[PDB]
A paper describes a structure:
We introduced the S247D exchange into PotF/D and into our high-affinity constructs E39D–Y87S–F88Y and E39D–F88A/L. The combination of S247D with the other constructs led to an affinity improvement with which the nanomolar range was reached for the first time, while keeping the order of affinities in the different mutants the same compared with the prior analysis. All structures but PotF/D–S247D adopt a fully closed wildtype conformation. In the F88L/A variants, Y87 is finally able to rotate toward the binding pocket and allows distal salt bridge formation. The orientation of the residues in both mutants is identical, confirming the F88L containing variant as a structural example for the noncrystallizable F88A construct in the first part of this study. Chain B as well as the A–B chain comparison behaves in a comparable manner. This deviation puts extra strain on the structure of F88L and especially the distal salt bridge since R91 is in the affected region. In general, the noise in the Fo–Fc map of this structure seems to indicate many flexible side chains. The “flexible” F88L structure is also the first in which we ever observed SPD taking alternate conformations in the binding pocket of which one does not mimic PUT-like positioning.
Numbering used by the authors: 29 to 376
Write the structure that this text describes.
């Protein structure tokens, strides 16, 4: 009896995907979840993860590729590899040259999830829901504070979006941009932010407890769908704002010390089946990287331009760059300062 260990993002598979695989193959799956690239990266770099498959973002795979923590994926054991969109593979290959290490899973953007009616109640019918002004202009956050504001607990995403909003390179390599203007804005916003968290905001949006969030697209569409299924009268939407936004791929990868490689390839090949991955997209509201699967994805998902954005929106999207250690230090320090920004100090 063989057992396959998988480590994936929360809210990123259909409820029955694993059970269906277990029934088909007789392999027992131990499925665990994370909501942060930082948590996964730490485990990959500290020692053995004990996992057979993990799901980093592509830029994280790129950041640690030369550290040797992943092993190359034997495409002879992935007969359905051909189902992946070959043009999307060329884009992922910027992170994974010649697609040696990573299987593209889903693609999306980092934007604003919001309660349509509460935002309009607080900011008016002309609330700037097509703009980062909705959540990064202090005058707006002051008005939204009590209906609840959340930011992702992701320093790379948050600093990049703030830098872009301030008219800087979202991937600036200038330390002063982080310690100066980006920190200045974040500290002005901080008193109005209820929490920094990368997964609680889904149910909080769905239930009406948070009115604006920095969020990942499909997470927000899941919140919208949860509210609809609950018949709770809450209207959640998502915006890829006009100033641009981060875009990203998440990918499956195999840790270099994986125990059960054969079973892992069986699971990857299962995910390459068009019906399997389209069913996932239908439940998690994320675009997959499987060309063969597209016709099977629900119309509600395929036709949503916040899931599959058109070319004029894609032209405004940017990709996360891996930063040098000095920028990493200054960004991480600034993040800790921002998150602790409400605490009282006694040094004056
Ligand atoms: C409305 O269908 C769009 C078809 O897109 C091709 C698929 C394979 O790529 C999805 C991208 C946007 N992650
Ligand atoms: C990659 O293909 C999707 C094309 O969308 C382009 C829209 C019509 N502006
Ligand atoms: Cl409410
Ligand atoms: Cl990425
Ligand atoms: Cl449909």
């Amino acid at each position: 009896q063989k057992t396959l260990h998988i480590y994936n993002w929360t809210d990123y598979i259909a409820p029955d995907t694993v059970a269906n695989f277990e029934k088909e193959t007789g392999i027992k799956v131990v499925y665990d979840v994370f909501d942060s690239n930082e948590v996964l990266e730490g485990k990959l770099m500290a020692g053995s993860t004990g996992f057979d498959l993990v799901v980093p973002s592509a830029y994280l795979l790129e950041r640690q590729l030369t550290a040797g923590v992943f092993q190359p994926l034997d495409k002879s054991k992935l007969p359905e590899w051909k189902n992946l969109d070959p043009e999307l593979l060329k884009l992922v290959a910027k992170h994974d040259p010649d697609n040696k290490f990573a299987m593209p899973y889903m693609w999306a953007t980092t934007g604003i999830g919001y309660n349509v009616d509460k935002v309009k109640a607080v900011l008016g019918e002309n609330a700037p829901v097509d703009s980062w002004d909705l959540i990064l202009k202090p005058e707006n956050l002051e008005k939204l504070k009590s209906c609840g504001v959340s930011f992702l607990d992701d320093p790379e995403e948050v600093f990049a979006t703030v830098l872009n909003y301030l008219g800087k390179d979202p991937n600036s390599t200038k330390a002063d941009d982080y310690t100066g203007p980006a920190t200045d804005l974040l500290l002005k916003l901080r008193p109005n932010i209820r929490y920094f968290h990368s997964s609680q905001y889904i149910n909080d949006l769905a239930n009406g407890d948070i009115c604006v969030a920095i969020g990942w697209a499909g997470d927000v569409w899941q919140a919208s769908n949860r509210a609809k299924e609950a018949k709770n009268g809450v209207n959640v939407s998502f915006s890829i704002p006009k100033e641009g936004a981060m875009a990203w791929f998440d990918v499956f990868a195999m840790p270099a010390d994986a125990k059960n490689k054969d079973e892992a390839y069986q699971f990857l090949n299962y995910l390459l089946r068009p019906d399997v991955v389209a069913h996932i997209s239908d439940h998690v509201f994320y675009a997959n990287a499987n060309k063969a699967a597209t016709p099977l994805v629900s119309a509600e998902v395929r036709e949503n331009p916040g899931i599959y954005p058109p070319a004029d929106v894609r032209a405004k999207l940017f990709t996360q760059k891996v930063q040098d250690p000095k920028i990493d230090r200054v960004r991480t320090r600034a993040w800790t300062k921002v998150k602790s920004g409400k605490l009282e100090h006694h040094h004056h």
